[PDB]
Amino acid sequence: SNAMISKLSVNPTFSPSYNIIVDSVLDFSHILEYVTNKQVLVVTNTTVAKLYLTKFLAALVDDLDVRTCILEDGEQYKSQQSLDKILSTLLENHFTRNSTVLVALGGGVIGDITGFAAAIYQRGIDFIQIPTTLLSQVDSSVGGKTAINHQLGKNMIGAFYQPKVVYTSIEFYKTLPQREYIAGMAEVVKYAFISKDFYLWLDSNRDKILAKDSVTLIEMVKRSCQIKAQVVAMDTGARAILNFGHTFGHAIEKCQNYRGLKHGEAVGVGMAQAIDFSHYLGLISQQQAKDFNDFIVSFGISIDFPNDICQKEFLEAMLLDNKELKFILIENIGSLSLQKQSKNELEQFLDISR
């Protein structure tokens, strides 16, 4: 009835609009409009299932044809093998193209695979997202990227597929581990470097954000989503800025074998590097770099570069992406650029690092 909620209309230029709902309580009924008289398959992992599945099923339980596919927890399971489980469940239970809906209940991993499945099953069926991690709330909810991993590369197979609705709740943070939360906070901070307005907003509401004030967190999520929506709306060209800090981030994950820092933790460290590298190239002053890194730390995000990564391998990891060597660099808050830079510059910059 009278519970703080927030809706944000996202309107893809090549698809019908949908809205991202962010609420203070956990009330899965906000999605019944897209689940009625439909064959529903919920995809989750063991953990999210343990915590939310029986509550979710209970929020429907209206004699509706509902099935579940519980994948294993982990990035390794965003695989073809898991995709086949989702696809067999759909085929074994004769889920038609017309009244089928996949519901992705979980974090980014579940969101990617479920979205991809929905994109290919009979060349596309309704897809509903329920991001249960901060990172997936502010990053998966907009853009339409869906994908799965291959032994030879992560996120190499996928599709652009929009959801019918995105329902999420700040209540999910009550069960989300501190590291996972902070990892997602790195994505939020990224939007602050993209948008000067957001930067000022976060800087003013830090106290409430850290104290987890419901009204504030809801708006924080909403504004992050608006920024990504506005960036993709520019079409994919100047959209590259969303990769601020990912070049260094992806390389950290590759060097640790994706068993060190979480994805979001790597982005945090990566942004700190893009900043320092931006200064090295003379794009920002030392003061600006100190201020920017301070800001990341300001929100509990760690910017320390992992001790177990060698310079040799780290440099090699960044060159694999002959082609040209492009980075997302900062010139000012709200001013990021896709910038081509030599291997020498990169190598010389990493010497200060060791």
Q: Interface residues with a second copy (CB under 8 A)?
A: 14, 80, 84, 87-88, 91-92, 96, 119-124, 145, 147, 150, 152-153, 156-160, 323
- Kindly tell me which residue out of 109, 327, 333, 336 binds Cl ion, with binding defined by CB under 5 A: 327
Q: Which residue, 97 or 212, has its beta carbon nearer to a second copy?
A: 97
**Considering the complex, what minimum distance in angstroms separates the CB of residue 118 from a second copy?**
12
Task: Confirm whether residue 348 is marked as ligand binding.
Answer: no
Q: Please list every residue from 133 through 172 that binds ligand NAD, using CB under 6 A.
A: 133, 135-136, 139-140, 143, 145, 155, 172
Residues 6+ apart with CB under 8 A from 26: 52, 55, 169, 171, 172
135 versus 283: smaller Cβ distance to ligand NAD: 135
Per DSSP, what are the bridge partners of residue 131? 106
Is 143 in contact with 11 (CB distance < 8 Å)?
Answer: no
Cβ neighbours of residue 199 under 8 Å, at least 6 residues apart? 192, 193, 295, 333, 334
Q: Which residues on neighbouring strands pair with residue 70, listed in sequence order?
A: 44
Residue 184 and residue 262: Cα distance in Å, rounded? 10
Is 212 known to sit in a ligand binding site? no
Nearer to ligand NAD, 131 or 350 (CB): 131
Residue facing ligand NAD at closest CB distance: 108
Which residue in the block uniquely carries the two structure tokens 């200060």? 352
Rg (CA), the chain: 20
Give whole-number Cα distances, 254 to 292, 319, 321, 330, 341, in Å: 25, 12, 12, 24, 21
Is the Cβ of residue 150 or residue 312 nearer to a second copy in the bound state?
Answer: 150
Q: Which does 274 bind (CB under 5 to 8 A by kind): Cl ion, ligand NAD, a second copy, none?
A: Cl ion
- Please list every residue from 71 through 110 that binds ligand NAD, using CB under 6 A: 73, 75, 78, 106-110
Say how many CA atoms lie within 13 Å of 230 toward its Cβ.
11
Among 23, 112, 219, 253, binds ligand NAD (CB under 6 A): 112
Least distance between a second copy and beta carbon 275 (Å): 27
Binding positions for ligand NAD, 235-264, rule CB under 6 A: 263-264
Which of 92, 90, 181 lies closest to 127, judged by CA? 90
Binding site: what residues are annotated? 45, 73-78, 108-112, 132-133, 145, 154, 172-175, 187, 246, 263
